[PDB]
Amino acid sequence: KGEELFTGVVPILVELDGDVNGHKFSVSGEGEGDATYGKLTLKFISTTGKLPVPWPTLVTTLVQCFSRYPDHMKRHDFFKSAMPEGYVQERTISFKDDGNYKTRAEVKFEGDTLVNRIELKGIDFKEDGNILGHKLEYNYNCESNVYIMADKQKNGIKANFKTRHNIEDGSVQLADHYQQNTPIGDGPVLLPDNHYLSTCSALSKDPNEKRDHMVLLEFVTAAGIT
């Protein structure tokens, strides 16, 4: 039933409240998703405290229901199956040789609009590390595979993946992601066979925007099953 909600272009709202090493910030995003093509277009704006971390480190936290599942894989699409009631998405993101984010989000429809509401908590970051020191390039050079498995005990899914963020000196900052999703509602959901999401992201700037912001274009396709 949920998959029928994604046959067209769907408006998206994203709202994040963050605290990283006591630095508080908030992000608001707007855009749209077209799961027929695995396509996301989103613009995010920082609305309160000076963004204490680099924009690229927030991409994965800031709607996998917009992934394109090939027809032969549609029985493996947990994300759409949980809609409209939605799912909780939780992660631990471990930055190598630095701190960690713990994120808790609720993704669901509010009327015709797909909403992602997030609380992010970061601790153990180094003052002159790549994150608090703002040493990461404004790009997303790595196309990551999100490896998904069923979690039948919790009627949901688990995932793990690595993202690699370019450092301004040419090196790379690794971020290990562990993820758990569970349905909010009491409808049946689809519990998938092992597979992955191939995720390609591109960051840009709005030349007329004076606020601290990030424009994101993303294509996401489910794969790993013939």
Swiss-Prot record:
The listed outcome for F44L is:
In mut3.3; shifts fluorescence lifetime from 3.03 to 1.88 ns. In R10-3; matures to the red-emitting state with excitation and emission maxima at 555 and 585 nm, respectively
Q: Which Gene3D superfamilies match?
A: Green fluorescent protein
Record's keyword terms, sorted: Chromophore, Luminescence, Photoprotein
Please give the tissue specificity annotation from the record for this chain. Answer: Photocytes.
- Consequence of changing I167L: In R10-3; matures to the red-emitting state with excitation and emission maxima at 555 and 585 nm, respectively
Biological-process GO terms, alphabetical: bioluminescence; generation of precursor metabolites and energy
Recorded hits in InterPro entries, A to Z, give: GFP, GFP-related, Green_fluorescent_prot
Q: State what changing Y140A does.
A: In Cerulean; leads to improved quantum yield, a higher extinction coefficient and is 2.5-fold brighter than ECFP
Domain of life of the organism encoding this protein: Eukaryota
Span of the secretion signal? none
Question: How do biotechnologists make use of this enzyme or protein?
Answer: Green fluorescent protein has been engineered to produce a vast number of variously colored mutants, fusion proteins, and biosensors. Further generation of mutants led to more stable proteins (at 37 degrees Celsius for example) with brighter fluorescence and longer fluorescence lifetimes.
Effect ascribed to mutating Q64L:
In RSGFP4; increases fluorescence and shifts the major exitation peak to 489-490 nm
Q: What's the effect of swapping V189A?
A: In mut1.5; shifts fluorescence lifetime from 3.03 to 2.72 ns
Give the consequence of mutating D151V: In EBFP2.0; shifts the excitation and emission spectra to shorter wavelengths and increases quantum yields compared to BFP
Provide an example Pfam family for this protein. GFP
Q: What is the effect of changing N194I?
A: In mut2.1; shifts fluorescence lifetime from 3.03 to 2.50 ns
Describe its function: Energy-transfer acceptor. Its role is to transduce the blue chemiluminescence of the protein aequorin into green fluorescent light by energy transfer. Fluoresces in vivo upon receiving energy from the Ca(2+)-activated photoprotein aequorin.
State the oligomer form and interacting partners.
Monomer.
Q: Which family does it belong to?
A: Belongs to the GFP family.
Protein's name in the database: Green fluorescent protein
Q: Which organism is it from?
A: Aequorea victoria
